[PDB]
Design a protein around this ligand. Structure first.
Ligand SMILES: Nc1ncnc2c1ncn2[C@@H]1O[C@H](COP(=O)(O)OP(=O)(O)O)[C@@H](O)[C@H]1O
Lengths: 271, 217
């Protein structure tokens, strides 16, 4: 729109306009430094974001999903436009945040926190190993023997259009094991620390999702700080019910931070 | 019979006979003489029993909020096997209102408290039951005192000396109320009390904790 175009423009006229470190801003060059090491995990400052334009604190929680998407789109359209040399290897991006003036302990988050901006910590426990999932929907026709084609995918929902090279026909189908896009996976099970309990009873816990960029960093019993966001499996079997819906809650990680972080770590001041 | 209080109130005609009994200076020995059904040897203690028959005074401490000194009454019987302590008091189990009868190696400390396990009624496990807090003010006729682990008998110090409980487990954590009077039928590590070796050491206990008791007749 007129205004709904200006989101990406604000990012563009942010990353090379809001400048500190005595000139020659990070996000002028920090993105270059991300492309250099082949990471694709650029991270953003909420502090600096508010120091530029406060506006995108309220325009986030109504759908932080679309905020993050409309950001990383800008990272591509900048990178491959100025670094078309990049356009072989990965050519896909998403960004992170590390400034949220809040720690929500566990046993603190409830129905108001639904599907919006979050922070919390805890302790790791046993979880899964290393697996991928899918990323794109494509099958194979057999009435005409064609491909159904690739189809636009919703987060956990079916598509099934009639349009396809088989005279837009062939309701039935089969599926291949290739020509389709993949995505690593790993899980976590988060517990709360033995210091900040309610002083003597059993503790609480909920589970957390990490994604293909995010695996083989955690371990059982490790130190941590994560933004994450509040999930909802939208149906853990609604019907003629219990005395209670069998619902659950997860957090999906955007930016995980280790609070030990025993590697060579810090950025550089300019001088 | 039991202790509802309301469903037990007596008529005045019985009060006639009750105060009639009270009108005997013979009453000091009458009920102690009415303790046994037929036993007619050396009842000289049955007067000492009867102060617990008429089971103690209620010196309440709703007065100052301080120091909570109940009229704690604690006496035990100890001696040889000849005495019918177990059988006398098996019959007295058929006397006491809160009649209990356990003894050394009938139930552990947790065999007295926290009967915790699964319950398929809830389809879950639950924090659960005990023994003594059902027997408040009551008695358990008890024998074979010198039979338990040190796990038990360091509980009894707590109650005999404070008449309390405060509990801490991973599930429920509790500060309940528990309080009552004793009967017991302790025994030594011996077959006969050894002549020229007092129960000051014969029964198996320490140096002045043996002295601690009110008086074991
Ligand atoms: N006055 C009495 N009336 C009835 N039985 C008696 C009397 N005096 C002794 N006995 C008998 O002596 C025995 C006492 O044994 P018991 O007291 O049960 O052993 P312990 O002293 O280890 O408890 C009982 O079997 C009981 O029949």
């Amino acid at each position: 729109l007129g205004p709904r175009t200006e989101i990406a423009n604000r990012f563009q006229s942010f990353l090379r306009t809001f400048v500190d470190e005595r000139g020659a801003y990070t996000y002028r060059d920090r993105i270059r430094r991300m492309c250099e090491q082949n990471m694709s995990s650029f991270v953003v400052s909420y502090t600096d974001l508010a120091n530029k334009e406060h506006v995108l604190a309220y325009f986030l929680p109504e759908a932080p999903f679309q905020m993050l998407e409309i950001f990383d789109k800008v990272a591509k359209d900048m990178v491959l436009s100025i670094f078309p040399t990049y356009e072989r290897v990965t050519t896909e991006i998403h960004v992170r945040i590390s400034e949220l003036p809040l720690i929500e302990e566990l046993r603190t988050f409830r129905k108001l926190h639904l599907n919006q901006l979050v922070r919390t910590l805890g302790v790791v426990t046993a979880t899964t190993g290393v697996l991928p999932q899918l990323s794109v929907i494509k099958y194979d026709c057999v009435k005409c023997g064609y491909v159904l084609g690739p189809f636009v995918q919703s987060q956990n929902t079916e598509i099934k259009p009639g349009s396809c090279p088989e005279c837009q026909s062939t309701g039935p189908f089969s599926i291949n094991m290739e020509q389709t896009l993949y995505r690593n996976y790993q899980k976590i099970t988060l517990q709360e620390s033995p210091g900040r309990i309610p002083a003597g009873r059993i503790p609480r816990s909920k589970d957390v999702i990490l994604l293909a960029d995010l695996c083989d960093q955690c371990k059982p019993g490790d130190e941590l700080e994560v933004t994450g966001i509040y999930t909802n499996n939208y149906d853990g079997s609604l019907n003629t019910d219990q005395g209670f819906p069998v619902f659950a809650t997860v957090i999906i990680a955007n930016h995980v931070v280790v609070k030990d972080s025993k590697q060579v770590v810090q950025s550089l001041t300019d001088e | 019979e039991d202790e509802e209080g309301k469903d037990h109130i007596f008529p005045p005609e019985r009060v006639e006979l009750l105060q009639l009994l009270a009108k005997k200076p013979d009453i000091y020995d009458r009920l102690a003489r009415a303790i046994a059904p037929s036993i007619y040897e050396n009842d000289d203690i049955k007067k000492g029993i009867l102060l617990q028959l008429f089971g103690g005074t209620k010196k309440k401490h709703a007065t100052l909020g301080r120091q909570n000194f109940r009229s704690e009454i604690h006496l035990l019987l100890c001696g040889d096997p000849g005495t019918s302590k177990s059988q006398m008091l098996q019959y007295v189990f058929n006397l006491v209102p809160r009649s209990q009868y356990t003894s050394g190696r009938g139930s552990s400390a947790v065999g007295l408290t926290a009967y915790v396990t699964k319950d398929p009624e809830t389809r879950q496990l639950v924090l659960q039951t005990g023994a003594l807090v059902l027997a408040d003010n009551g008695v358990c006729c008890i024998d074979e005192f010198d039979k338990m682990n040190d796990s038990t008998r360091s509980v009894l110090h707590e109650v005999m000396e404070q008449q309390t409980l405060s509990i801490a487990k991973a599930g429920i954590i509790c500060q309940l109320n528990a309080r009552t009077s004793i009967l017991a039928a302790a025994n030594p590590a011996e077959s006969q009390w050894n002549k020229r070796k007092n129960i000051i050491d014969n029964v198996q206990l320490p140096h002045t904790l043996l002295s601690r008791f009110d008086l074991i007749f």
